[PDB]
Enzyme design. Structure first.
Site, PDB file in Angstrom:
ATOM      1  N   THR A 177       0.792  -1.217   0.000  1.00 53.25           N
ATOM      2  CA  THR A 177       0.000   0.000   0.000  1.00 53.25           C
ATOM      3  C   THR A 177       0.826   1.270   0.000  1.00 53.25           C
ATOM      4  O   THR A 177       0.533   2.241  -0.696  1.00 53.25           O
ATOM      5  CB  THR A 177      -0.953  -0.045   1.225  1.00 53.25           C
ATOM      6  OG1 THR A 177      -1.934  -1.069   0.964  1.00 53.25           O
ATOM      7  CG2 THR A 177      -1.622   1.282   1.456  1.00 53.25           C
ATOM      8  N   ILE A 178       1.856   1.311   0.850  1.00 50.94           N
ATOM      9  CA  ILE A 178       2.678   2.510   0.969  1.00 50.94           C
ATOM     10  C   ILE A 178       3.785   2.475  -0.112  1.00 50.94           C
ATOM     11  O   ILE A 178       3.924   3.477  -0.781  1.00 50.94           O
ATOM     12  CB  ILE A 178       3.319   2.621   2.356  1.00 50.94           C
ATOM     13  CG1 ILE A 178       2.273   2.810   3.456  1.00 50.94           C
ATOM     14  CG2 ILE A 178       4.379   3.707   2.397  1.00 50.94           C
ATOM     15  CD1 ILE A 178       1.297   3.922   3.236  1.00 50.94           C
ATOM     16  N   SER A 197       4.811   6.792  12.056  1.00 49.81           N
ATOM     17  CA  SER A 197       3.624   6.110  11.540  1.00 49.81           C
ATOM     18  C   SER A 197       2.573   7.070  11.050  1.00 49.81           C
ATOM     19  O   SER A 197       2.557   8.257  11.381  1.00 49.81           O
ATOM     20  CB  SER A 197       3.042   5.145  12.577  1.00 49.81           C
ATOM     21  OG  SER A 197       2.194   5.838  13.476  1.00 49.81           O
ATOM     22  N   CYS A 198       1.537   6.581  10.318  1.00 45.28           N
ATOM     23  CA  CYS A 198       0.502   7.483   9.831  1.00 45.28           C
ATOM     24  C   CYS A 198      -0.173   8.357  10.856  1.00 45.28           C
ATOM     25  O   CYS A 198      -0.604   9.506  10.561  1.00 45.28           O
ATOM     26  CB  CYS A 198      -0.589   6.664   9.074  1.00 45.28           C
ATOM     27  SG  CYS A 198       0.088   5.417   7.933  1.00 45.28           S
ATOM     28  N   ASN A 199      -0.608   7.781  11.991  1.00 43.61           N
ATOM     29  CA  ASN A 199      -1.349   8.589  12.977  1.00 43.61           C
ATOM     30  C   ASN A 199      -0.358   9.487  13.746  1.00 43.61           C
ATOM     31  O   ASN A 199      -0.722  10.603  14.083  1.00 43.61           O
ATOM     32  CB  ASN A 199      -2.200   7.718  13.903  1.00 43.61           C
ATOM     33  CG  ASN A 199      -3.464   7.210  13.157  1.00 43.61           C
ATOM     34  OD1 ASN A 199      -4.164   7.998  12.527  1.00 43.61           O
ATOM     35  ND2 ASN A 199      -3.696   5.913  13.246  1.00 43.61           N
ATOM     36  N   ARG A 236      -9.014   2.792  11.728  1.00 43.22           N
ATOM     37  CA  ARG A 236      -9.737   1.842  10.787  1.00 43.22           C
ATOM     38  C   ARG A 236      -8.990   0.528  10.948  1.00 43.22           C
ATOM     39  O   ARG A 236      -7.774   0.439  11.227  1.00 43.22           O
ATOM     40  CB  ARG A 236      -9.763   2.479   9.414  1.00 43.22           C
ATOM     41  CG  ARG A 236      -8.363   2.580   8.781  1.00 43.22           C
ATOM     42  CD  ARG A 236      -8.086   1.259   8.108  1.00 43.22           C
ATOM     43  NE  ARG A 236      -6.831   1.050   7.460  1.00 43.22           N
ATOM     44  CZ  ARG A 236      -5.726   0.547   7.983  1.00 43.22           C
ATOM     45  NH1 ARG A 236      -5.648   0.202   9.278  1.00 43.22           N
ATOM     46  NH2 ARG A 236      -4.610   0.451   7.270  1.00 43.22           N
ATOM     47  N   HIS A 278       1.505   5.874  20.242  1.00 40.70           N
ATOM     48  CA  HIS A 278       1.544   7.156  19.597  1.00 40.70           C
ATOM     49  C   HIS A 278       2.233   8.250  20.382  1.00 40.70           C
ATOM     50  O   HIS A 278       2.989   9.046  19.784  1.00 40.70           O
ATOM     51  CB  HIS A 278       0.104   7.596  19.212  1.00 40.70           C
ATOM     52  CG  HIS A 278      -0.500   6.462  18.413  1.00 40.70           C
ATOM     53  ND1 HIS A 278      -1.165   5.414  19.002  1.00 40.70           N
ATOM     54  CD2 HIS A 278      -0.520   6.240  17.082  1.00 40.70           C
ATOM     55  CE1 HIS A 278      -1.554   4.569  18.068  1.00 40.70           C
ATOM     56  NE2 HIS A 278      -1.194   5.050  16.889  1.00 40.70           N
ATOM     57  N   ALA A 279       1.980   8.323  21.684  1.00 45.95           N
ATOM     58  CA  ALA A 279       2.558   9.373  22.527  1.00 45.95           C
ATOM     59  C   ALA A 279       4.074   9.299  22.488  1.00 45.95           C
ATOM     60  O   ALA A 279       4.740  10.298  22.230  1.00 45.95           O
ATOM     61  CB  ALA A 279       2.003   9.217  23.946  1.00 45.95           C
ATOM     62  N   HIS A 304      -8.785   6.769   9.496  1.00 46.66           N
ATOM     63  CA  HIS A 304      -8.777   6.893  10.943  1.00 46.66           C
ATOM     64  C   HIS A 304      -9.375   8.273  11.286  1.00 46.66           C
ATOM     65  O   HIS A 304      -9.576   9.082  10.369  1.00 46.66           O
ATOM     66  CB  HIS A 304      -7.393   6.867  11.520  1.00 46.66           C
ATOM     67  CG  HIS A 304      -6.428   5.819  11.118  1.00 46.66           C
ATOM     68  ND1 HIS A 304      -6.596   4.467  11.350  1.00 46.66           N
ATOM     69  CD2 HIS A 304      -5.213   5.959  10.530  1.00 46.66           C
ATOM     70  CE1 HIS A 304      -5.501   3.844  10.933  1.00 46.66           C
ATOM     71  NE2 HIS A 304      -4.644   4.712  10.421  1.00 46.66           N
ATOM     72  N   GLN A 321      -4.774   6.907   5.962  1.00 44.16           N
ATOM     73  CA  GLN A 321      -3.697   6.027   6.244  1.00 44.16           C
ATOM     74  C   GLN A 321      -2.950   5.526   5.030  1.00 44.16           C
ATOM     75  O   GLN A 321      -1.737   5.294   5.114  1.00 44.16           O
ATOM     76  CB  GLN A 321      -4.127   4.837   7.122  1.00 44.16           C
ATOM     77  CG  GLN A 321      -5.033   3.772   6.509  1.00 44.16           C
ATOM     78  CD  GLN A 321      -6.433   4.269   6.256  1.00 44.16           C
ATOM     79  OE1 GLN A 321      -6.872   5.237   6.905  1.00 44.16           O
ATOM     80  NE2 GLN A 321      -7.173   3.661   5.314  1.00 44.16           N
TER      81      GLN A 321
END
Lengths: 340, 340
Positions: A11-12, A138-140, A167, A193-194, A219, A300
């Site tokens: 995908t990426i 990462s994406c998020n 998602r 994420h943090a 997302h 994403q």
């Protein structure tokens, strides 16, 4: 001239490969993939050259898709590798790059230790200049970093707490769930994420929670930002409306739903219906004194694409931050302002 | 040239407007729409003239999108109207087109009596030549007719039994279910498809049943054909492999899932990810004596687009069935043979 290899045509991978092709100072040598699926067939029909693990050549070669050479063949005959292999495989290729003396860009599901620094072009491009190994977040994480670093221009961002509604799997994936469940991801606070955000902004007080929802398109993030100084709303709205890689979604055209934004991208004829920009609902922008709240959507499949391009520029030190992002932005038709 | 209006700029209308733009012998006069949503915004931005029902003009104009005139105006200005309004609305416009003396093409959701004939280009273009009012059959009726009129070249189709699995709602619709149910559609046998096929092929013994699944991408058909004579698979396969508007899906590249087919379209860079062709699963093709069994996918957002273009040519007696289908096919990038 930078000759770029792409390791892992998923995908990426497929998107970065097409982004590389549109760049004026880069050439795509080829891409690495293990299975001859339809992504590979289509790539070969488009004239992209496909490199394969030596052990899979026989198997791969049975499908008729010609193999240009092995994955080491690709790494050796490139000047830098954009690694878009599955979580954990980058670290496995890391020793290979080292041995062949190739810089490499890694994705955000890798451990930070795979790279010499972690990256987001709107935040620490200058700090990444010259790093031989760079981990694109990462994406998020990327969406959080773009929002933060941009809000930070109006006032120092003191605290961030966020809930990420992820998602479950991309639309093309047919074997992944959940079909109908919310699944804490994980249950423990905080989500990864943090920390990922702390690999780019060392000292931010950040706490995040995440859950998986049975959706495939985008997302969504729900943010609470604490600033230093009481701010005006026009100022938070001024800078959100004028930052490439960030778009605003109004409530004027009845498109505030992730599915309807995908439809907006199909009708706008964006390649693969991608929206690499952070999609902030303008009606959610809440600023009271030193507190900011808002929600946005994250696509994403494409959000890190432009970041991999600038990361390449950062790594090989081809140009400034502003120069890199200006070419990347223009060549990949990146918007700012209102998407819809 | 031939001036064409599109009444109802929704899933089908937006795509019939774009196909009209691509024809060498047609010009899009404008499109008709009631609400100023993101689809109207995007049309307006592309220079498409938008006409609105008299009683909606002021609310529409609150959006700032200019309105070229009433629907009647649009009607009066065209040489022919492509009606793509909601089921039942076509019948409401039928008397207006008659009084304003304009030929019209209607969609499959209308009753057969709204037109002078029902149509599918691979089957009865010659019979529809000169008809002022033509009903293009529904998306799943179309896919059944293309398959039956093509197979019929190998041996007369004497009987059809089919089961249709319908997608619940298109991907942009966020207010329709079901989320997680199978829903007889209807529970009585046969569903409307059989009658609709018979509006095109009058004496065929056909019965169909249909059900709604919680999917948004594509419908699927599962069919059993009884032929007059015993045939060879190779002959069925050879016609199915050489007919525009029908494509074959192999099991070679891991793409036998409607979501993977949407993906194929995205990576092939087809407009809006549209796949207007009937997608027959080539491993599904079962031929034994006079019995044929097979299954196929149908992309409901686009299958009738090329059909509406040919219908314009039939109604206005512009050229032969073969000439029209060749221009429609070439200009819209319609495929034949293996898609994947």
């Amino acid at each position: 001239m930078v000759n770029v290899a792409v390791n892992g045509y998923g995908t990426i991978g497929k998107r970065v490969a097409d982004a590389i092709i549109k760049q004026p100072d880069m050439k795509l040598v080829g891409v690495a993939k293990t299975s001859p699926n339809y992504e590979a067939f289509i790539a070969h029909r488009r004239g992209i050259r496909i490199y394969v693990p030596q052990q899979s050549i026989k198997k791969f070669e049975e499908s008729g898709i010609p193999v240009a050479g092995t994955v080491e063949d690709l790494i050796k005959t490139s000047d830098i590798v954009v690694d878009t292999t599955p979580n954990g495989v980058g670290a496995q290729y890391k020793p290979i790059y080292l041995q062949l003396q190739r810089n490499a860009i890694f994705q955000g599901g890798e451990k930070a230790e795979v790279a010499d620094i972690s990256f987001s072009a709107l935040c620490n491009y200058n700090e990444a200049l010259g790093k031989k190994y760079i981990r694109v977040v990462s994406c998020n994480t990327t969406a959080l970093l773009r929002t933060i670093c941009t809000v930070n221009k109006v006032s120092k961002v003191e605290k961030v707490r966020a809930t990420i509604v992820r998602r479950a799997a991309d639309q093309k994936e047919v074997k992944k769930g959940p079909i109908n469940s919310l699944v804490p991801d994980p249950a423990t606070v905080p989500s990864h994420h943090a920390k990922d955000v702390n690999s780019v902004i060392r000292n931010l007080d950040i706490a995040t929670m995440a859950v998986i929802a049975p959706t495939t398109l985008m997302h969504m993030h729900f943010i609470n930002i604490t600033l230093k100084d009481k701010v005006e709303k026009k100022d938070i709205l001024s800078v959100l409306e004028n930052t490439p890689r960030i778009v605003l979604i109004s409530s004027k055209y009845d498109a505030e739903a992730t599915a309807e934004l995908v439809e907006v991208a199909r009708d706008l004829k964006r390649d693969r219906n991608d929206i690499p920009e952070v999609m902030i609902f303008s009606d959610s922008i809440y600023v009271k004194d030193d507190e900011v709240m808002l929600m946005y959507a994250v696509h994403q499949e494409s959000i890190v694409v432009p970041e991999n391009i600038d990361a390449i520029r950062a790594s090989m030190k081809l140009m400034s931050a502003e120069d890199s992002m200006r070419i990347t932005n223009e060549s990949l038709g990146i918007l700012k302002g209102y998407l819809i």
